Ligand binder design. Structure first.
Ligand SMILES: NC(=O)c1ncn([C@@H]2O[C@H](COP(=O)(O)OP(=O)(O)OP(=O)(O)O)[C@@H](O)[C@H]2O)n1
Ligand SMILES: NC(=O)c1ncn([C@@H]2O[C@H](COP(=O)(O)OP(=O)(O)OP(=O)(O)O)[C@@H](O)[C@H]2O)n1
Length: 1677
């Protein structure tokens, strides 16, 4: 172990760091009445003398010099010798050790003072009544007993039953329904208005208006079109971004002319030229939709439960008469659920489970679950399509696969600025038989009805829906059938009735009344849960995650949670059913193998099905009801204001508590270190606790320092660090300069009104738009910022008085949204000098910021080629380290920079590059400290062992309780599952300095650097609100009474943007240091509890930042000490004592999610009771239906199959797995890669062109369907589907039986050439069988759509986790708009000027006069330095021009252009049906399906010279270690009943193929297990040679393309070119594979040693660092 001091800061002490008086205040504030200042200093600087056994002697001299300097600067006489300090610190030990007993007495007094003040509620009903009483006390008379003023019961949209077959013959089936309703709505006027909820005083007077509006819109304002063209969209260039989807200017944006009406497309109509009485009727109907006063019903309303107990069974009657049999959602769900035998390889033993799944599918078919979900999905489609394009004088009649359903959509909030939603009136035709049940069910929203024929025509009430609510309505086919399947499985009456009957006898007719009632509840709950669009239902359902703990003890959650902080916001009826289910569960728990519920007689909360055989069924039902709700139905505008509003309040609370005023700095005070309640710690106890923690954790200072400076990439340049190189995002305050602003104002003349070209017109527009209403501040900015005062304003006078200028109005958000960003910059900056300063932080990549930092380190600001190339080559040139750049940044910004670097923004938080580097240093010097702690969970690599540590924390605790309580005394268990509240907001930050001073694995210079870093992070941090949000609050504050909650007080009345956030580190920034402090606090808790005299306590705790998993086992005289601690049992003891102890460590325990029990613990989401773990597969099942990224079909299908895989891991039953398959299929296919029957299908396209591939053999990237079985998807993952179909077509191609025959036939090198020649001859003369055409198709697909194709991992870093990739990559930007606003492009465009800057066509013309010379120079200084463009930067001049030589490849600007951005819905369902661009430069615009047709027609021919990709695709499949041993196990596995499996329910999968396959690869003994598998299954050991040699072939071709063209067999000389010409013999890839298969050189790298050999043939082996890298078979563990 060698020691290296990594600082120029060596001669700096922690008491001379500019912000050094705060350390003096911390020292002065730690002085107690028993410990003086001298002992505090001697302990704090000198604690390292307990660690002096593993550190160097130069480290000894360094730390003793730091000790002496600290004592001299603090006016204390230091000890002369190190042994003198050791003797003094070992003799003043009992003074410091006595703090634990006083702390024990303090927490006992705090429990005694806290339990006396609280009040006790007698029962749960009194808690509910007290909540209702205080709710009436806030707002009086808010509770109404009349059910006529409430909100809508049955949510956004209503689905009647569809009773008549509608024949179509030349009548356009979508349009025949509209004229059917029109001819129904032409009879007389027997309009009966509906009184809601059987009321008597019906006002009406609006039902007449709605009826007249609907009659007008269906009689006069619309007609049978049947001839107009469909809506077609086209991509267009935006003035701020690229490639947005919009309607074309002609055709589908123009109003056509039918007979006396105006029409746009097949659905939209208009009334621009209509009679005045008709216009009056239209406006009278429009005024209804608007184009305390809360009536909340009580929890104990017996009328609402009685009404719901008729509404929810009228719904079941309505869900029982539908006659439709085929559809889109029905087809995809019946692909998996109607025949689930294909998913399971050994399906012959699942004769009961698969039959139950088939019965659940038949019940879904007969109750019209699929058809209702499909109707909701397409109506949400049509509704948001209507939301963006509708005007006030137009409507958008929607029709679907329905028979008796329409919707009359009206003007919504196009160009979304929050808004309210899109109005819509739905019409229904119901027959005479189901007429009373329709009135009973939808009694609130039926607005008028009349009778025509044997039918009733219903007009329902208009509502409105935001885009988020339409998106939650969209995922109905993914959310409702899985709800029906899970609730039908977990209900024991439903499953019990399903098990006796047969598939031909399952119907509603042969049902008992109890099973029918359970089915009614299941249908109603699935409908109400799968589509949720109300905030009250979300409040009710996330109230449910705390009122659901049965096996419990004292938690302060049964009664004190249902008091004041519970919000009973029940607005409608029939959520009384859900709240009443909660109330019955709580009343049951009040009156009091896991068998938890066969004896308690528990009741399901949403589905009410009794006789619960297992507690895990209850946990699964509640948590699936919880996790299926959306994250938020609020807009991003409201959510961002909430996220920017919480820290302002939690900082104003801190300032008010500790006496700081609003506009001043933050310094330590005595109150923070005096053991107070709100914002304080104990002080001297914290120092002793941290010293004891560092004594007990760090065992070798030098070895751990070596691991820190070797594994965290210290003493290495910053581009080797993945956090500071991989472009996440960043924040750099780029503001147009004020001198540049006044210069642009000066050069903007008044004689060039026509010639206002360039970007200066944007500055002119911004200053004029600011002048139009903000005259008060523009004169101040024009007279104080610039030295010329009157000239600028007098020039602006005739600038506005020039007559012609393009400004409409200060429309605020309408100006911001669709104008150039520098217009926003100027419209800000001309009124921001002394107030409202903003200083807008625009986002940037960290790679560009690191590029600028490396450029600024070597003083190469102005870019010059000789200046960068003079830095040397190889591993002997100029190179920096991470800490040298860190101190360069610190020395730069300590020089009066204005503290612009400490500015974060919300985009979860967006910090600067400096703050990212300081947080990296502080984070990763404590990551290894937390890695040495066995009780620390955030240091666990991944989520794999997170469950494992909880398993140990249960197992050793239970084993020790079994080993102690049987001998001498009694023991009581106490498991704590705490979660702290405001872990970052309420936390004192200055206590982290004490964790750094006492750190022994450090240096007195590095410690000073970290202390100064944390002190500037506290004293100078600020938060900048974004421009649109701050303008919204500014205009709201101007219109209103000018008061705000906390943001107005912090920003001096909203007159400035940056508000101070000092003692609140942002969440995720200190995630290891806070966890270290938490574990230190728990060790101090154990040391404090060890001070009790006649009792023995041992504590086991587990810490992951915010969370806690404390266990405690007491022994001895328990009965006396329990009333000493003021409690009744050990969980009550633990919940009181830990809460009292944590207040001395600035940790706030909240009595909401923190419970204490004697048998149950929870950690994050996993949960283990009495040595057995409850599975909780709810999160993955909900992620299978709700969470998606919305980027592509391939990406989202591969991402959702992760959740399917973890569903298979965590014990899912075998009847929800086919529904999980169907759910991920609907969620992947329902946006862009369209559903069966639509335009972007892949079964239909492959069937039309006669492709030889079958339905279940289409690859995933071809738009095909996930058809991998249960076992290979569970073991390998989503990347196994294409591997399985490739292996199947290969095994059919060479006509073999097993994989081993294929392996020993491929292993001969003279075999695949003969097969390829035989295939070529077969294609030649006369014969091509089906297998040959399949093999040819997949060979050409591997050529055209391999994952390595058109990708390099050094421009954008990818991971290569699959075999193939997306074959259409839509460009997010067109031309060089993606490459702009970049320092790399601005440098590349300067030393290589506009001959090669603008544009891609100018560079492409240099491949067939000055651009050819520039390209020749580029590739001449590129090909002489080969290591700079296709490996990682070895040093500088391998990084600064590595970012410069990537803007020359056509496939490296395309890769940066089509980067996957976030976007949202309606930007991808519209782009899929639009004529999109192909690449970065093409005049041709073509659709997605036509592109797919062209690509499939391209990959149909044999295309000889395809031998290399044939051998590559064979060898990528067969050579996998995991696949080649998983397949023979699956092929030769015994069914059951010998050692594999003998149980039935949820015990085939976890007994037959996840334990005899885990005795397969690593060998194992355990029988039943929930699996956290190994790392990712590697299919990228062979693909990173493909990328790293494809880029070599590309630069070879682009180097050889200038001087000459040639074909082959080149004779030129100049060895680096002749050897690459010999390298390009066939493709260079078969040469790569064969040549480095038959030898293995493996020469080391020094870039002169390796360039000594040859530039081409053995050099490429040192551009991947490995060859034929075969991994080991992964242990599932
Ligand atoms: N992005 C939008 O279009 C939108 N959505 C809701 N809002 C807020 O609510 C009002 C109604 O929106 P509009 O801009 O369509 O109404 P308008 O201003 O009276 O009509 P117009 O566009 O023809 O001038 C608007 O005045 C505005 O305050 N704006
Ligand atoms: N009630 C609690 O016991 C609790 N648990 C966490 N927190 C801290 O609260 C900050 C923001 O709260 P959020 O609105 O994001 O939800 P949350 O974290 O789940 O807390 P809560 O249950 O109170 O809503 C978050 O920064 C979070 O750390 N409070």
């Amino acid at each position: 172990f060698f020691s290296h001091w990594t600082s120029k800061y060596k001669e700096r002490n922690p008491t001379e760091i500019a912000y050094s008086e705060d350390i003096e205040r911390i020292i002065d504030s730690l002085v107690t009445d028993e410990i003086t200042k001298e002992e505090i200093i001697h302990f704090l600087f000198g604690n390292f003398c307990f660690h002096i056994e593993t550190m160097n002697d130069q480290h000894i001299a360094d730390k003793f010099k730091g000790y002496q300097s600290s004592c001299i600067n603090l006016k204390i006489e230091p000890k002369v010798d190190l042994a003198d300090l050791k003797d003094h610190l070992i003799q003043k030990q009992q003074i410091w050790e006595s703090l634990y007993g006083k702390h024990l007495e303090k927490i006992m007094l705090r429990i005694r003072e806290k339990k006396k003040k609280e009040k006790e509620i007698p029962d749960i009903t009194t808690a509910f009544n007290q909540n209702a009483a205080e709710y009436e006390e806030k707002y009086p008379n808010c509770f109404t007993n009349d059910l006529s003023e409430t909100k809508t019961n049955f949510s956004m949209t209503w689905s009647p039953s569809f009773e008549k077959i509608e024949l179509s013959s030349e009548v356009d089936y979508n349009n025949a329904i509209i004229n059917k309703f029109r001819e129904s709505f032409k009879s007389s006027s027997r309009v009966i208005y509906n009184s809601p909820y059987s009321s008597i005083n019906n006002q009406t007077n609006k039902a007449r208006d709605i009826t007249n509006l609907v009659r007008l819109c269906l009689t006069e304002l619309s007609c049978d079109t049947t001839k107009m063209e469909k809506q077609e969209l086209e991509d267009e260039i935006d003035i701020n971004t690229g490639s947005i989807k919009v309607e074309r200017t002609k055709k589908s944006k123009e109003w056509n002319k039918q007979g006396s009406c105006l029409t746009r497309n097949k659905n939209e109509f208009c009334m621009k030229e209509t009679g005045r009485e008709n216009k009056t009727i239209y406006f009278k109907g429009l005024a209804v939709m608007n184009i305390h006063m809360k009536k909340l019903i009580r929890h104990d309303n017996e009328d609402s439960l009685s009404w719901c107990e008729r509404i929810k069974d009228s719904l079941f009657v309505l869900h029982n008469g539908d006659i439709r049999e085929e559809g889109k959602i029905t087809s995809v769900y019946n692909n998996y659920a109607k025949n689930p035998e294909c998913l399971y390889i050994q399906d012959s033993v699942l004769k009961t489970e698969l039959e139950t799944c088939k019965k659940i599918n038949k019940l879904c078919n007969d109750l019209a679950i699929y058809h209702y979900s499909e109707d909701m999905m397409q109506f949400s489609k049509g509704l948001m399509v209507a939301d963006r394009y509708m005007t006030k004088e137009s409507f958008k009649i929607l029709t679907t696969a329905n028979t008796s359903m329409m919707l009359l959509a009206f003007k919504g909030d196009g160009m979304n600025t929050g808004g309210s939603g899109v109005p819509y009136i739905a019409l229904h035709i119901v027959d005479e038989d189901m007429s009373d049940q329709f009135n009973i069910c939808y009694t609130k929203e039926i607005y008028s009805y009349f009778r025509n024929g044997s039918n009733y025509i219903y007009i329902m009430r208009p509502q409105r829906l935001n885009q988020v609510r339409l998106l939650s309505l969209f995922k109905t086919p993914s959310k409702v059938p899985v709800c029906f399947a899970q609730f039908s499985k977990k209900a024991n009456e439903m499953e019990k009735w399903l098990k006796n009957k047969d598939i031909e006898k399952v119907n509603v007719f042969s049902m008992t009344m109890t099973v029918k009632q359970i089915l009614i509840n299941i249908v109603f709950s699935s409908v109400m849960i799968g589509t949720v669009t109300k905030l009250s239902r979300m409040g009710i359902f996330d109230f449910m995650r705390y009122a659901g703990f049965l096996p419990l003890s004292d938690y302060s959650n049964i009664k004190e949670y249902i008091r004041d902080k519970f919000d009973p916001d029940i607005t409608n009826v029939a959520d009384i059913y859900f709240v009443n289910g909660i109330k019955k569960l709580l009343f049951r728990m009040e009156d009091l193998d896991i068998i938890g519920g066969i004896t308690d007689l528990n009741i399901k909360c949403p589905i009410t099905g009794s006789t619960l055989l297992t507690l895990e069924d209850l946990y699964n039902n509640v948590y699936l009801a919880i996790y299926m709700m959306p994250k938020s139905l609020h807009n991003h505008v409201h959510n961002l204001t909430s996220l920017l509003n919480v820290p302002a309040e939690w900082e104003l609370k801190f300032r008010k508590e500790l006496g700081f005023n609003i506009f001043e700095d933050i310094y330590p005070k005595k109150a923070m270190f005096d053991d107070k309640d709100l914002f304080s710690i104990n002080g001297a106890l914290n120092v002793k606790a941290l010293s004891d923690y560092y004594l007990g954790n760090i065992e070798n200072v030098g070895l751990m320092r070596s691991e820190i400076e070797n594994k965290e990439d210290f003493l290495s340049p910053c581009y080797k660090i993945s956090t500071l190189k991989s472009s996440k995002k960043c924040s750099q305050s780029n503001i147009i300069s004020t001198d540049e602003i006044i210069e642009c104002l000066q050069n903007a003349k008044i004689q060039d009104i026509e010639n206002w070209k360039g970007n200066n017109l944007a500055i002119i527009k911004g200053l004029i738009r600011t002048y139009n209403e903000e005259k008060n501040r523009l004169v101040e900015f024009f007279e104080d910022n610039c030295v010329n005062s009157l000239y600028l304003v007098e020039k602006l006078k005739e600038i506005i008085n020039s007559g012609s200028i393009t400004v409409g109005k200060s429309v605020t958000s309408k100006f911001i949204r669709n104008n150039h960003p520098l217009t926003v910059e100027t419209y800000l900056k001309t009124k921001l000098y002394y107030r409202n300063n903003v200083t807008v932080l625009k986002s940037k990549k960290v790679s560009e910021e690191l590029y600028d930092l490396v450029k600024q380190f070597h003083n190469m600001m102005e870019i010059d080629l000789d200046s960068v190339m003079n830095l040397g080559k190889g591993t002997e040139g100029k190179k920096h380290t991470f800490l040298q750049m860190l101190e360069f940044v610190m020395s730069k910004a300590k020089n009066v920079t204005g503290s612009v670097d400490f500015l974060v923004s919300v985009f979860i938080y967006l910090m600067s590059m400096k703050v990212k580097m300081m947080l990296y240093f502080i984070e990763h010097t404590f990551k290894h400290v937390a890695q040495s702690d066995p009780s620390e969970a955030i240091s666990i690599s991944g989520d794999n062992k997170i469950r494992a540590l909880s398993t140990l924390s249960l197992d050793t605790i239970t084993s020790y309780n079994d080993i102690l309580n049987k001998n001498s005394k009694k023991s009581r268990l106490a498991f704590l599952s705490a979660d702290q509240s405001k872990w970052s907001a309420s936390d004192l930050t200055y206590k982290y300095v004490l964790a750094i001073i006492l750190n022994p694995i450090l240096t007195t210079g590095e410690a000073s650097l970290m202390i100064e870093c944390i002190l500037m992070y506290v004293k100078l941090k600020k938060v900048c609100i974004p421009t649109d949000i701050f303008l919204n609050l500014r205009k709201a504050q101007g219109t209103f009474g000018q008061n705000e909650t906390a943001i107005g007080l912090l920003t001096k009345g909203l007159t400035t943007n940056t508000y101070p956030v000092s003692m609140n580190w942002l969440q995720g920034n200190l995630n290891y240091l806070s966890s270290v402090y938490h574990s230190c606090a728990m060790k101090a808790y154990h040391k404090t509890l060890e001070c009790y005299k006649d009792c023995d306590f041992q504590t086991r705790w587990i810490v992951h930042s915010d969370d806690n998993a404390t266990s405690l086992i007491a022994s001895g005289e328990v009965d006396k000490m329990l009333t000493d601690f003021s409690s009744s049992s050990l969980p009550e003891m633990l919940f009181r004592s830990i809460e009292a102890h944590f207040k001395s460590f600035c940790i706030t325990l909240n009595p909401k999610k923190s419970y204490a029990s004697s048998s149950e613990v929870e950690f994050i989401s996993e949960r283990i009771v009495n040595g057995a773990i409850i599975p909780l597969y709810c999160r993955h099942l909900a992620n299978c239906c709700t969470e998606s990224s919305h980027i592509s079909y391939f990406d989202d299908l591969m991402s959702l199959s992760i959740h399917v895989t973890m569903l298979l891991r965590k014990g899912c039953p075998n009847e929800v797995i086919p529904f999980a398959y169907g759910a991920v299929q609907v969620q992947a296919l329902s946006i862009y890669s369209m559903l069966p029957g639509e335009v972007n299908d892949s079964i239909r396209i492959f069937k039309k062109l006669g492709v030889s591939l079958k339905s279940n053999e289409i690859p995933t990237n071809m738009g095909g369907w996930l058809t991998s079985p249960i076992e290979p998807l569970s073991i390998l993952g989503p990347s196994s589907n294409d591997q399985i179909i490739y292996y199947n077509v290969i095994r059919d191609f060479l006509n073999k039986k097993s994989l081993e025959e294929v392996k020993d036939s491929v292993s001969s090198s003279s075999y695949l050439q003969m097969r390829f020649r035989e295939l070529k001859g077969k294609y030649e003369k006369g014969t091509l069988e089906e297998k040959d055409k399949k093999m040819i198709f997949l060979i050409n697909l591997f050529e055209k759509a391999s994952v390595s194709e058109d990708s390099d991992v050094l421009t954008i870093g990818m991971k290569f986790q699959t075999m193939l990739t997306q074959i259409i990559k839509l460009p997010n930007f067109i031309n060089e708009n993606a490459l702009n606003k970049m320092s790399s492009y601005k440098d590349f465009s300067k030393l290589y000027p506009n001959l090669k800057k603008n544009e891609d066509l100018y560079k492409s013309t240099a491949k067939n006069i000055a651009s050819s010379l520039e390209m020749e120079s580029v590739h001449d200084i590129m090909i002489k330095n080969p290591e700079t463009i296709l490996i990682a930067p070895l040093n500088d001049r391998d990084f600064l021009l590595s970012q410069l030589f990537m803007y020359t490849s056509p496939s490296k600007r395309n890769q940066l252009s089509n980067q996957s951005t976030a976007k949202l819905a309606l930007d991808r369902v519209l782009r899929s049906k639009a004529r999109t661009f192909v690449d970065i430069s093409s005049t041709e615009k073509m659709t997605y399906e036509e592109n797919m047709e062209k690509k499939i027609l391209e990959m149909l021919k044999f295309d000889l010279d395809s031998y290399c990709s044939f051998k590559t695709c064979v060898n990528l499949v067969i050579k996998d270690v995991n696949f080649s041993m998983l397949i023979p196990i699956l092929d030769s596995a015994y069914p059951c009943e010998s050692r594999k499996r003998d149980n039935y329910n949820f015990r085939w999968f976890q007994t037959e193929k996840w334990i005899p396959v885990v005795e397969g690869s690593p060998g194992l003994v355990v029988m039943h297990a929930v699996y956290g598998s190994n790392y990712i299954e590697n299919l990228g050991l062979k693909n990173i040679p493909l990328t790293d040699d494809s880029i070599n072939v590309l630069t070879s071709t682009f180097g050889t393309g200038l001087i000459m063209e040639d074909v082959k067999s080149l004779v030129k000389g100049k060895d680096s070119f002749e050897t690459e010409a010999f390298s390009n013999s066939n493709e260079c890839q078969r040469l790569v594979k064969a040549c480095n298969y038959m030898i293995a050189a493996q020469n080391r790298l020094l870039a002169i040693n390796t360039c000594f050999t040859r530039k081409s043939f053995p050099f490429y082996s040192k551009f991947n660092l490995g060859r034929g890298f075969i991994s080991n078979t992964l242990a599932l563990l």
